Amino acid sequence: SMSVKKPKRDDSKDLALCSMILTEMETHEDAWPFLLPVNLKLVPGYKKVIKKPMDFSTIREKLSSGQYPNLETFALDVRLVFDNCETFNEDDSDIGRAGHNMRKYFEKKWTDTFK
Numbered sequence: 001s002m003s004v005k006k007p008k009r010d011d012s013k014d015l016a017l018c019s020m021i022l023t024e025m026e027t028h029e030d031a032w033p034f035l036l037p038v039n040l041k042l043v044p045g046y047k048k049v050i051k052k053p054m055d056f057s058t059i060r061e062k063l064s065s066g067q068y069p070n071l072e073t074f075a076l077d078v079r080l081v082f083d084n085c086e087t088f089n090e091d092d093s094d095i096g097r098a099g100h101n102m103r104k105y106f107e108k109k110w111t112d113t114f115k
């Protein structure tokens with residue numbers, strides 16, 4: 001509360017570390033469904049169903065331009081990618097399995113880096 005604060009965590013490396021995690025996810029061989037925005041004109045159903053589209057290149061652009069106020073807002077966009085994937089894709093599909101794999105890959109990096 002006013003004039004009463006927990007000891008100050010060093011956050012000066014967060015921007016660089018999030019960038020490294022995102023790089024490692026961009027180069028995973030199961031990244032291909034997530035590299036670019038889903039084409040809303042070519043994929044029937046997607047625009048109406050998926051209210052907040054998100055993908056790795058959009059995340060990279062936001063990160064590089066100071067549009068994430070902190071650690072948590074970055075992780076929320078990453079999770080949003082895989083939440084969208086689950087909504088639109090059957091678990092038993094190549095893209096469905098790619099989503100599950102990438103989420104697991106992300107959460108491990110996240111834990112080891114910050115938690």
Ligand SMILES: CNC(=O)c1scc2c1OCCO2
Pocket residue numbers: 032033034038043084085088089095
């Ligand atoms: C995460 N990706 C998707 O949910 C979808 S839906 C249709 C697609 C695609 O990824 C790119 C190939 O075409």
